[PDB]
Design a protein around this ligand. Structure first.
Ligand SMILES: *[C@@H]1O[C@H](CO)[C@@H](O[C@@H]2O[C@H](CO)[C@@H](O)[C@H](O)[C@H]2NC(C)=O)[C@H](O)[C@H]1NC(C)=O
Length: 358
């Protein structure tokens, strides 16, 4: 559209990912591979606010971005993921979300949003782009027979509403998570998906700050595949461009000229999955297309790196309180540490298998 949130801005680079990557590169013994790894700290990623404990970090990033913009004569942009719904990840075998619907989950989540708004309010010279709640609304399309998801439906809808409505008041550009081509891109899922996302957009007042949708977050799909991944059989929308090309007109018909961002951070290697639903620490993944607004699609504002490659998706240790058995599948890299903690061997392969090369 006319207003691409990224145009004319310099993206603030995550210091947390930068620190993880710096510590990782010096453990990589091959000196040319190590230097390639270190340059990954120069590639913009999204910062995940997956708990209230991450909110002070947001404050420091906004303040640092503000000072960097003044130091360099630029306008800075901070990239965040809103990821703390009560009863988070309702269809998963395990979730790490700190809030529960049974224990004031909605009110606690609204306080989490309020604390994020109170930080953003203080730095109006910094632009913020937020991905809204991966692995949430997409469950309300296809997973309503999971009892945890059926029970969470009204809370997901109310809490996402609260996030959209209140982040809009401080001017945050927002992309609702919308799964990926293998989830909502199935032709039969397109209309129910469009209906849900449009209703959410309406409930939040159709704010122009609700730009559209984020796809392939933390996943591995191609944006544009040379040949369909065997896991996609039965779905004519076998990559993200097919999915977005099919969904975007349905949103436009409802009055919402929605645009998209697409995670490609771990999309460099295709055809590495046994089944499309396999999502955890998929073995052999490589860093993919670097973030850019040169997307080739009228519908896509940016290719992005939302999931930071090298942070684990989940432990493969079946004795952990947080164990998700998806993370022990044959196509899952093992042994894997706890979700969010650094997974050095996985990072090294992301670097070695990067396509385009680093
Ligand atoms: C796999 O998970 C279990 C439990 O989460 C870990 O075993 C516990 O580890 C803690 C800290 O080392 C100890 O206090 C407990 O006594 C252990 N309980 C049992 C039954 O062993 C286990 O260490 C984890 N394995 C790995 C590689 O992380």
């Amino acid at each position: 559209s006319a207003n691409n949130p990224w145009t004319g801005f310099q993206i603030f680079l995550s210091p947390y990912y930068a620190n993880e990557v710096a510590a990782a590169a010096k453990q990589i013994t091959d000196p040319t591979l190590s230097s390639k790894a270190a340059s990954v700290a120069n590639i913009p990623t999204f910062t995940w606010l997956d708990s209230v404990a991450k909110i002070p970090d947001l404050g420091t990033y906004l303040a640092s971005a503000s000072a960097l913009g003044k130091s360099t004569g630029t306008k800075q942009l901070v990239q965040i993921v809103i990821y703390d719904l009560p009863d988070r990840d309702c269809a998963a075998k395990a979730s790490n979300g700190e809030f529960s619907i049974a224990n004031n989950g909605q009110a606690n989540y609204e306080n989490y949003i309020d604390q994020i708004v109170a930080q953003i309010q203080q730095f109006p010279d910094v632009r913020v782009v937020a991905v809204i709640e991966p692995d949430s609304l997409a469950n309300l399309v296809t997973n309503l027979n999971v009892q945890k998801c059926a029970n969470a439906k009204t809370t997901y809808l109310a809490s996402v509403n609260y996030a959209l409505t209140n982040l809009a008041k401080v001017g945050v550009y927002m992309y609702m998570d919308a799964g990926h081509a293998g989830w909502l891109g199935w032709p039969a899922n397109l209309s129910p998906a469009a209906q849900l996302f449009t209703q959410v957009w309406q409930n939040a007042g159709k704010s122009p700050f609700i730009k559209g949708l984020a796809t392939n977050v933390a996943n591995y799909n191609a944006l544009q595949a040379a040949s369909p991944d065997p896991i996609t059989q039965g779905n004519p929308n076998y990559d993200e461009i097919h999915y977005i090309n099919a969904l975007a007109p349905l949103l436009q018909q409802a009055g919402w000229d929605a645009t998209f961002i697409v995670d490609q951070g771990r999309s460099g290697v295709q055809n590495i999955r046994q089944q499309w639903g396999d999502w955890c620490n998929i073995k052999g993944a490589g860093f993919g297309t670097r973030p850019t607004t040169n997307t080739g699609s009228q519908f896509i504002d940016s290719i992005v790196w939302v999931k930071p490659g090298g942070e684990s998706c989940g432990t493969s240790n079946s004795s952990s309180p947080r164990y998700d058995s998806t993370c022990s599948l044959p196509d899952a890299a093992q042994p894997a540490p706890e979700a969010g903690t650094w997974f050095q061997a996985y990072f090294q392969t992301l670097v070695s298998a990067a396509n385009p090369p680093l």
